[PDB]
Design a protein around this motif. Structure first.
Motif, PDB file in Angstrom:
ATOM      1  N   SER A   1       0.763  -1.228   0.000  1.00 49.12           N
ATOM      2  CA  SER A   1       0.000   0.000   0.000  1.00 49.12           C
ATOM      3  C   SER A   1       0.814   1.311   0.000  1.00 49.12           C
ATOM      4  O   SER A   1       1.687   1.536   0.851  1.00 49.12           O
ATOM      5  N   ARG A   2       0.533   2.152  -0.991  1.00 44.57           N
ATOM      6  CA  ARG A   2       1.176   3.450  -1.123  1.00 44.57           C
ATOM      7  C   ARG A   2       0.084   4.522  -0.943  1.00 44.57           C
ATOM      8  O   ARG A   2      -1.103   4.189  -0.809  1.00 44.57           O
ATOM      9  N   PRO A   3       0.470   5.812  -0.843  1.00 43.58           N
ATOM     10  CA  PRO A   3      -0.569   6.833  -0.687  1.00 43.58           C
ATOM     11  C   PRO A   3      -1.329   6.915  -1.999  1.00 43.58           C
ATOM     12  O   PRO A   3      -0.806   6.548  -3.063  1.00 43.58           O
ATOM     13  N   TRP A   4      -2.571   7.360  -1.929  1.00 45.34           N
ATOM     14  CA  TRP A   4      -3.362   7.484  -3.131  1.00 45.34           C
ATOM     15  C   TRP A   4      -2.665   8.559  -3.939  1.00 45.34           C
ATOM     16  O   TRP A   4      -2.235   9.569  -3.379  1.00 45.34           O
TER      17      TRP A   4
ATOM     18  N   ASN B   1      -0.436  -1.685   8.259  1.00 50.73           N
ATOM     19  CA  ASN B   1      -0.625  -0.679   7.227  1.00 50.73           C
ATOM     20  C   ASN B   1      -1.005   0.656   7.833  1.00 50.73           C
ATOM     21  O   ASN B   1      -2.153   1.099   7.726  1.00 50.73           O
TER      22      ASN B   1
ATOM     23  N   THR C   1      -0.260   4.949   8.609  1.00 50.35           N
ATOM     24  CA  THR C   1      -0.016   6.143   7.825  1.00 50.35           C
ATOM     25  C   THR C   1       0.336   7.228   8.832  1.00 50.35           C
ATOM     26  O   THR C   1      -0.048   7.139  10.002  1.00 50.35           O
TER      27      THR C   1
ATOM     28  N   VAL D   1       2.720  12.247   2.913  1.00 49.93           N
ATOM     29  CA  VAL D   1       2.369  11.328   3.976  1.00 49.93           C
ATOM     30  C   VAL D   1       3.236  10.078   3.944  1.00 49.93           C
ATOM     31  O   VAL D   1       3.662   9.615   2.882  1.00 49.93           O
TER      32      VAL D   1
ATOM     33  N   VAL E   1       3.616   6.035   4.849  1.00 43.44           N
ATOM     34  CA  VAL E   1       2.716   4.880   4.960  1.00 43.44           C
ATOM     35  C   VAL E   1       3.515   3.594   5.150  1.00 43.44           C
ATOM     36  O   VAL E   1       4.012   3.026   4.175  1.00 43.44           O
TER      37      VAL E   1
HETATM   38  C1  LIG Z   1      -3.388   1.284   3.894  1.00 43.33           C
HETATM   39  O1  LIG Z   1      -3.542   2.548   4.537  1.00 43.33           O
HETATM   40  C2  LIG Z   1      -3.714   3.642   3.674  1.00 43.33           C
HETATM   41  C3  LIG Z   1      -3.462   4.894   4.546  1.00 43.33           C
HETATM   42  O2  LIG Z   1      -4.564   5.328   5.348  1.00 43.33           O
HETATM   43  C4  LIG Z   1      -5.034   3.450   2.917  1.00 43.33           C
HETATM   44  O3  LIG Z   1      -5.158   4.422   1.898  1.00 43.33           O
HETATM   45  C5  LIG Z   1      -6.360   5.182   1.860  1.00 43.33           C
HETATM   46  O4  LIG Z   1      -7.312   4.518   1.029  1.00 43.33           O
HETATM   47  C6  LIG Z   1      -8.557   5.219   0.889  1.00 43.33           C
HETATM   48  C7  LIG Z   1      -9.538   4.378   0.089  1.00 43.33           C
HETATM   49  O5  LIG Z   1     -10.072   3.414   0.988  1.00 43.33           O
HETATM   50  C8  LIG Z   1      -8.273   6.531   0.283  1.00 43.33           C
HETATM   51  O6  LIG Z   1      -9.506   7.191   0.191  1.00 43.33           O
HETATM   52  C9  LIG Z   1      -9.714   8.197  -0.811  1.00 43.33           C
HETATM   53  O7  LIG Z   1      -9.350   9.540  -0.383  1.00 43.33           O
HETATM   54  C10 LIG Z   1      -9.459  10.519  -1.432  1.00 43.33           C
HETATM   55  C11 LIG Z   1      -8.754  11.846  -0.960  1.00 43.33           C
HETATM   56  O8  LIG Z   1      -9.501  12.592  -0.024  1.00 43.33           O
HETATM   57  C12 LIG Z   1     -10.980  10.568  -1.855  1.00 43.33           C
HETATM   58  O9  LIG Z   1     -11.058  11.225  -3.112  1.00 43.33           O
HETATM   59  C13 LIG Z   1     -11.652   9.173  -2.106  1.00 43.33           C
HETATM   60  O10 LIG Z   1     -13.061   9.343  -2.048  1.00 43.33           O
HETATM   61  C14 LIG Z   1     -11.219   8.104  -1.094  1.00 43.33           C
HETATM   62  O11 LIG Z   1     -11.938   8.265   0.122  1.00 43.33           O
HETATM   63  C15 LIG Z   1      -7.293   7.340   1.111  1.00 43.33           C
HETATM   64  O12 LIG Z   1      -7.002   8.541   0.445  1.00 43.33           O
HETATM   65  C16 LIG Z   1      -6.008   6.565   1.321  1.00 43.33           C
HETATM   66  N1  LIG Z   1      -5.131   7.285   2.253  1.00 43.33           N
HETATM   67  C17 LIG Z   1      -3.905   7.732   1.988  1.00 43.33           C
HETATM   68  C18 LIG Z   1      -3.195   8.456   3.109  1.00 43.33           C
HETATM   69  O13 LIG Z   1      -3.349   7.586   0.901  1.00 43.33           O
HETATM   70  C19 LIG Z   1      -5.055   2.132   2.213  1.00 43.33           C
HETATM   71  O14 LIG Z   1      -6.314   1.999   1.598  1.00 43.33           O
HETATM   72  C20 LIG Z   1      -4.733   0.973   3.183  1.00 43.33           C
HETATM   73  N2  LIG Z   1      -4.767  -0.285   2.434  1.00 43.33           N
HETATM   74  C21 LIG Z   1      -5.077  -1.469   2.955  1.00 43.33           C
HETATM   75  C22 LIG Z   1      -5.053  -2.650   1.983  1.00 43.33           C
HETATM   76  O15 LIG Z   1      -5.379  -1.624   4.142  1.00 43.33           O
END
Ligand SMILES: *[C@@H]1O[C@H](CO)[C@@H](O[C@@H]2O[C@H](CO)[C@@H](O[C@@H]3O[C@H](CO)[C@@H](O)[C@H](O)[C@@H]3O)[C@H](O)[C@H]2NC(C)=O)[C@H](O)[C@H]1NC(C)=O
Ligand SMILES: *[C@@H]1O[C@H](CO)[C@@H](O[C@@H]2O[C@H](CO)[C@@H](O[C@@H]3O[C@H](CO)[C@@H](O)[C@H](O)[C@@H]3O)[C@H](O)[C@H]2NC(C)=O)[C@H](O)[C@H]1NC(C)=O
Ligand SMILES: *[C@@H]1O[C@H](CO)[C@@H](O[C@H]2O[C@H](CO)[C@@H](O)[C@H](O)[C@H]2NC(C)=O)[C@H](O)[C@H]1NC(C)=O
Lengths: 219, 217, 223, 110
Positions: A164-167, D1, D3, D78, D80
């Motif tokens: 997992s990387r940042p979105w 996982n 962040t 960020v 992660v």
């Molecule tokens: C591992 O952890 C990371 C870090 O928290 C998780 O990434 C996050 O994944 C979610 C989707 O479930 C991303 O959500 C999106 O955010 C954007 C920006 O506001 C929005 O446009 C979308 O509607 C959606 O909600 C979230 O951004 C992202 N976080 C980061 C810091 O990148 C990841 O999903 C985790 N993976 C596993 C397999 O547990």
């Protein structure tokens, strides 16, 4: 001096083929001018040794690509993404060919491409890094995956990393770019069982007075 | 000033077909540097222009290989080999070469779709509105195809020439259809003084004028 | 990633002047030229003039020489355009653009701003009257249902008709407004599938920011 | 996982590591997975470290080692951390300052 204004593109994104940089296909320069605010708007990638790739392309002074007859046996070619939208639809880097599993199996690919011209060849390829094992087996049935690019002189094997990387533009997976220069009379041999982000030909290499400069100064 | 002369003015093409807009300048657009700075922009209704083809025949970023330009000096042309639904819009050709920079008058492309009949609907004044002392005889003859359609208000079976608001929308970006709304607006006094409004649509597609009415009681 | 933000709409009393803004972002203003255009409703796209954000070396179309005043504030990447003593004819959509100079491979404008609509009028700002539209005599709730909404007597444009706070997106047709006595009337018509109307609530939310009015009209079954 | 977002207006230095058990006993014993991978990244960088099981010379009893790595998080980016074993996680960050500082090797009195 032939100055090529990079507009919103860095040299790399114009090299790979990010949709908004395709306006720079096959361009040549004496001095490429990269702007501080140039941005990527395609599939999230990273380049191990970005400095040297950038240096050597800059110094070459040309983005002239020659498309080669690479035959990808039993895989699904031309994958795209909505991260790299190319128009109203999804897309990818104009000079990279994303290969996905065909039917229900990803065969151990083993192509070859001989340098039968009297000049060096620059080969730009990559590796995919699915963020989930779902994605991994989903795309490349093998769960594992390895890329092995080589010539009679060099050899490179890249092993993908699931995680997992940042979105970044929706995605949480990345692509790592690598390169290989094929000297005349040598042969390139791509060999993999998944995750390959295959090439589409080579870029010509020229030795000369070219370079690159960072500046938001008017031309 | 240089004059950009485009033709056609409206171009009805059918999905799959090949559109072809033409541009003509009052004097060569070849620059002293030999570069012809002729460009093609696409303005989708309710949007800002978008570069489509620059320097006569180069596709700007994003535009697909189905768009092609060409020409020399004064006469240039844009060609969409296979027209899609999204291609719906207005096309301008402009020139940089000479100051003042000039644009063409636009060529409204229009998609041809399978003929369709409206889905007439009428609504009687709201109590809310007539309390204010006014009546809304609103009829939405929408989703038809040949833009060409003829509506008429009847009232006791006799008239339409007074107070009819008419607005047709732009061709849709999928249905490739059209929609309209006709509004007869009379006083509360006048309205209560009749029963029968009749929104009558004469759209060349059905053999029976599509008519809709309601009762004051 | 490159944006050119313009304010959408402006109402100006005739004889006065409007200073339009165009916040460039995504690139460095200075690095490229800027062109302002005027689009009359008929379609016509006119070049008002140019400005070189670097030095402020402007170049106007002779026709707008004594009207438009191009200036830029490098501090905040905001280009501007002043139009003095406006008249009916000056009501149009004004666009600013990134004019990529002759030293680029393109040399033309590639990114356009969203445009701004300058309404030159002495007419007062009136809030809309939002009248719900539902079927009655002979329930037309058969193969499908067309619900209406009449946004009547407001000024100046624009209003934003939206159904169920946007959720009920897939079936609406908001029709262009039409001026009539210095008042605007417009209607929107969503179409819900029979088993979706009286059951829940279909509401048309209209907004006239020009008057800080936000209306929520629930279409009730007159049926 | 996990962040960890850089919501401060300064760069952050993150010091982390990876474990290298000398035996597969130790491996599964400590980190049940037998395999193990560490993947530290930001929107700009990405790092994946794969541990190596094996025998090293005894050093302070041990025959296993730890490899140290680092990651600098620029403001607004960020961090992660993502792994299935062998991680030698951080506890925060060290502040980074640009200036006239340096280091010198010397057994000279001060
Ligand atoms: C591992 O952890 C990371 C870090 O928290 C998780 O990434 C996050 O994944 C979610 C989707 O479930 C991303 O959500 C999106 O955010 C954007 C920006 O506001 C929005 O446009 C979308 O509607 C959606 O909600 C979230 O951004 C992202 N976080 C980061 C810091 O990148 C990841 O999903 C985790 N993976 C596993 C397999 O547990
Ligand atoms: C692989 O081979 C190495 C090399 O011979 C083995 O390491 C040796 O392991 C023993 C423990 O069985 C270590 O013994 C200790 O020596 C210290 C120092 O004198 C003493 O304090 C303790 O009482 C103990 O005897 C030995 O030092 C160490 N040798 C070296 C060179 O590091 C290793 O155990 C082998 N591993 C496997 C899995 O076969
Ligand atoms: C990029 O440059 C090449 C080089 O000219 C263009 O490819 C044609 O070019 C050669 C001769 O002119 C041939 O060796 C190439 O194989 C041939 N390739 C193709 C796909 O036709 C190539 O089209 C140029 N690309 C662009 C976008 O201009």
């Amino acid at each position: 001096h032939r100055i090529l204004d990079g507009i919103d593109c860095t040299l790399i994104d114009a090299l790979l083929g990010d949709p908004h940089c395709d306006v720079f296909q096959n361009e040549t320069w004496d001095l490429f001018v990269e702007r501080s605010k140039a941005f990527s708007n395609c599939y999230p990638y990273d380049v191990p040794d970005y400095a040297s790739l950038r240096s050597l392309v800059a110094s070459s002074g040309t983005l002239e690509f020659i498309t080669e007859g690479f035959t990808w046996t039993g895989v699904t070619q031309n994958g795209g993404s909505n991260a790299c939208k190319r128009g109203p639809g999804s897309g990818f880097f104009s000079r990279l060919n994303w290969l996905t599993k065909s039917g229900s199996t990803y065969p151990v690919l083993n192509v070859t491409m001989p340098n039968n011209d009297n000049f060096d060849k620059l080969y730009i390829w990559g590796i995919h890094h699915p963020s989930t094992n779902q994605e991994q087996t989903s795309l490349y049935v093998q769960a594992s995956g390895r890329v092995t690019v080589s010539t009679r002189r060099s050899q490179q094997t890249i092993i993908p990393n699931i995680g997992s990387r940042p979105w970044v533009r929706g995605l949480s997976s990345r692509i790592s770019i690598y390169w290989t220069i094929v000297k005349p009379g040598d042969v390139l041999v791509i060999n993999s069982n998944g995750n390959l982000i295959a090439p589409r030909g080579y870029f010509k290499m020229r030795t000369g007075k070219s370079s690159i400069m960072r500046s938001d100064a008017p031309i | 000033d240089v004059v950009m002369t485009q033709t056609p003015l409206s171009l009805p093409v059918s999905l799959g077909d090949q559109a072809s807009i033409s541009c003509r300048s009052s004097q060569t657009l070849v620059h002293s540097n030999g570069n012809t700075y002729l460009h093609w922009y696409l303005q989708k209704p309710g949007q800002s222009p978008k570069l489509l083809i620059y320097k006569v025949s180069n596709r700007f970023s994003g535009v697909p290989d189905r768009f092609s330009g060409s020409g020399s000096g004064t006469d240039f042309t844009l060609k969409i080999s296979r027209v899609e639904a999204e291609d719906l819009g207005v096309y301008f050709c402009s020139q940089n070469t000479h100051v003042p920079y000039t644009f063409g008058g636009g060529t409204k492309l229009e998609i041809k779709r399978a003929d369709a009949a409206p889905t007439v609907s009428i609504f009687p004044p709201s109590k809310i509105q007539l309390t204010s002392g006014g009546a809304s005889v609103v009829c939405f003859l929408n989703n038809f195809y040949p833009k060409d359609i003829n509506v008429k208000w009847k009232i006791d079976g006799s008239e339409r020439q007074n107070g009819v608001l008419n607005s047709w929308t732009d061709q849709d970006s999928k249905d490739s259809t059209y929609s309209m709304s006709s509004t007869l607006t009379l006083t509360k006094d006048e309205y209560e003084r009749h029963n029968s409004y009749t929104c009558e649509a004469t759209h060349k597609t059905s053999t029976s004028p599509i008519v809709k009415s309601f009762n004051r009681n | 990633q490159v944006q050119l933000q313009q304010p959408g709409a402006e109402l100006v009393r005739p004889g006065a002047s409007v200073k339009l803004s165009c916040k460039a972002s995504g690139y460095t203003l200075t690095t490229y030229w800027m062109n302002w255009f005027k689009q009359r409703p008929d379609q016509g796209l006119e070049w008002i003039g140019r400005i070189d954000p670097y030095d402020s070396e402007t170049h106007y179309n002779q026709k707008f020489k004594d009207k438009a005043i191009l200036t830029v504030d490098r501090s905040s990447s905001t280009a501007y355009m002043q139009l003095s003593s406006l008249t009916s004819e000056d009501s149009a959509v004004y666009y600013c653009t990134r004019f990529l100079q002759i030293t680029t491979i393109i040399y033309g404008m590639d990114y356009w701003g969203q445009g701004t609509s300058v309404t030159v009028s002495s007419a007062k700002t009136t809030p809309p009257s939002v009248y719900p539209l539902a079927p009655g005599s002979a329930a037309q709730t058969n193969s499908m249902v067309t619900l209406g909404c009449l946004v009547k007597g407001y000024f100046p444009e624009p209003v934003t008709v939206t159904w169920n706070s946007g959720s009920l997106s897939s079936g609406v047709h908001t029709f262009p407004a039409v001026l009539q006595s210095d008042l605007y009337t417009l209607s929107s018509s969503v179409t819900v599938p029979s088993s979706t109307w009286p059951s829940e609530t279909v509401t048309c939310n209209v907004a006239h920011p020009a008057s800080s009015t936000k209306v929520d009209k629930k279409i009730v079954p007159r049926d």
